[PDB]
Amino acid sequence: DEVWVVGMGIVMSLIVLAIVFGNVLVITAIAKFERLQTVTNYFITSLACADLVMGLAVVPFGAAHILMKMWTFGNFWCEFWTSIDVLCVTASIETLCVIAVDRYFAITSPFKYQSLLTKNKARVIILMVWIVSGLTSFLPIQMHWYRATHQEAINCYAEETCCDFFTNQAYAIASSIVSFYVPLVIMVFVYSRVFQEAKRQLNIFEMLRIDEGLRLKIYKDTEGYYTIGIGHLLTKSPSLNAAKSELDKAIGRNTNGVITKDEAEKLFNQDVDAAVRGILRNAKLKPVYDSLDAVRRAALINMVFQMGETGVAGFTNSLRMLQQKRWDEAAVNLAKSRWYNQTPNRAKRVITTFRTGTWDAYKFCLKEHKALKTLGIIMGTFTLCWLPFFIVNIVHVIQDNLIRKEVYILLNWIGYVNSGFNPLIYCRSPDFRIAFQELLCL
Ligand SMILES: CC(C)CCC[C@@H](C)[C@H]1CC[C@H]2[C@@H]3CC=C4C[C@@H](O)CC[C@]4(C)[C@H]3CC[C@]12C
Ligand SMILES: CC(C)CCC[C@@H](C)[C@H]1CC[C@H]2[C@@H]3CC=C4C[C@@H](O)CC[C@]4(C)[C@H]3CC[C@]12C
Ligand SMILES: CC(C)CCC[C@@H](C)[C@H]1CC[C@H]2[C@@H]3CC=C4C[C@@H](O)CC[C@]4(C)[C@H]3CC[C@]12C
Ligand SMILES: OC[C@H]1O[C@H](O[C@H]2[C@H](O)[C@@H](O)[C@H](O)O[C@@H]2CO)[C@H](O)[C@@H](O)[C@@H]1O
Ligand SMILES: CC(C)NC[C@H](O)COc1cccc2[nH]c3ccccc3c12
Ligand SMILES: *C(=O)CCCCCCCCCCCCCCC
């Protein structure tokens, strides 16, 4: 009865604590560590600020409203508190929308995975977002455009103890469409093509980058020989400067044992080309390669990279089954390899590629593609937490009072609670994660 309201107070208090704590941690980590100061994370700050204000200024008074079963803060704060609520929700979806557009142009740019924005106009953009949100949110509420004209609403408006968001149908449609729906549809569309573009970036270079690894410094392979990039043997000589002489020769400058990622790609493309020409010479490998599609050809090249031509020609049964496009049967045999024993994970991806003829086994392996997924979860989680509430907004314009009020309020709180989710989702990122553990005296 009244023990339940103490318990509900505890829960709601923890919710308030969770939102403010996590979002302050995000804001702190980005502001403190220069590594985290990217154009993307500036928008995350804008996003964390909206959630923080939601935390401090919006949720406690909403919680007090429900527990006290009445509004005890007067009608100025009621209109002000309502304004901040709408603003924070509007600013969030707008910021999320800006991120999607920003990520789109960053991934379609010849200078990949970096914004077309300097840190300063990015700040400007954020300022404009908050200003547009303010104009969209604060203006209609304080200009009383939102208000309904029927008597029950007028009672609530005048009553200093009643804080209910009675709205006229013109506002309810327009406001919810402008604030929520317009940047939602844009965000969902734009970021869906962000994913398609990211998936399109997958090729044999990314494949071997994931399976083999890319080193910028000269290193020794398992047999002790000097190597660099993606398994590119420099020399069998035990002399380090012999390797460096060989490296400088191939790259075309004085490297001192260090090359760039793009330079490693140049070496890799040359190794791929050599691998293909050797395959076409090998009597046992040529018919298989000729029959295979582009993606599966990359899988076969992947194996030649790891085993050499002689090693791959050893699989006599698998090769003929690949040649006949009996993928599953080829998979059964390749899984019984010494190759699968020693490096099961890599073999698993290559074999799976042989089965589907797609790059699906290499999705979200790259650190950059994982980052895109985290942002995708942020957007999705926001959508799912707020969409039911905003659907009911429009449902009641069509036919009012079809949904019980305690359901409407509950949906609104699923929206509120979303403000505490984003900080936890950021723990997916390795950089945020260690940024957090430093900050927590760990
Ligand atoms: C308005 C009332 C209800 C809420 C209090 C607003 C506070 C939480 C907001 C308003 C202005 C915000 C800040 C504005 C300036 C930046 C610089 C950035 O590098 C880190 C975050 C930081 C420092 C913000 C964090 C918190 C902040 C101070
Ligand atoms: C409307 C009242 C109640 C709250 C004020 C909204 C605050 C939280 C908004 C208003 C202008 C915003 C900021 C505008 C400029 C930037 C610079 C960027 O580097 C970090 C975020 C930051 C700092 C924004 C987030 C926080 C911010 C300060
Ligand atoms: C009214 C309620 C919401 C106010 C509660 C304020 C709490 C959430 C604030 C007040 C002091 C804050 C902390 C102060 C000490 C640090 C260490 C720093 O490296 C990271 C942030 C961290 C961990 C803060 C996290 C949250 C914190 C505990
Ligand atoms: O056999 C052809 C390629 O072999 C090297 O790259 C191998 C390396 O031999 C091996 O130790 C390791 O396990 O795999 C890498 C690549 O997967 C060559 O130096 C390449 O240039 C050859 O194409
Ligand atoms: C307790 C109430 C005040 N909380 C409202 C939601 O948190 C935020 O709802 C909105 C956010 C952004 C734009 C909006 N337009 C609306 C029209 C009717 C109802 C809510 C909204 C709305
Ligand atoms: C290791 O970083 C983290 C330890 C930091 C301890 C700081 C102690 C903060 C105490 C919080 C009290 C503020 C409560 C405010 C209530 C209104």
Author numbering: 29 to 230, 1002 to 1161, 263 to 342
What did the original publication write about this model?
Here, a method for presenting crystals of soluble and membrane proteins growing in the lipid cubic or sponge phase for in situ diffraction data collection at cryogenic temperatures is introduced. The method is a variant on the recently introduced in meso in situ serial crystallography (IMISX) method that enables crystallo­graphic measurements at cryogenic temperatures where crystal lifetimes are enormously enhanced whilst reducing protein consumption dramatically. The new approach has been used to generate high-resolution crystal structures of a G-protein-coupled receptor, α-helical and β-barrel transporters and an enzyme as model integral membrane proteins. Insulin and lysozyme were used as test soluble proteins.
The β2AR used in this study is the carazolol-bound form of a fusion between the human β2-adrenoreceptor and T4 lysozyme. Carazolol is a tightly bound partial inverse agonist with a low off-rate that stabilizes the receptor in a particular conformation. The space group was C2, with unit-cell parameters a = 108.04, b = 170.58, c = 40.44 Å, α = 90, β = 106.30, γ = 90°. The data were collected with 0.1° and 0.3 s per step from 149 crystals in one well with 3° of data per crystal. 104 partial data sets were processed satisfactorily and merged, providing a final data set with a total angular coverage of 312°. As expected, the published and the IMISXcryo structures are remarkably similar, with a backbone r.m.s.d. value of 0.200 Å over 442 residues. The IMISXcryo data were collected using 30 nl of mesophase representing 0.58 µg protein and 18 nl 9.9 MAG/cholesterol mixture.
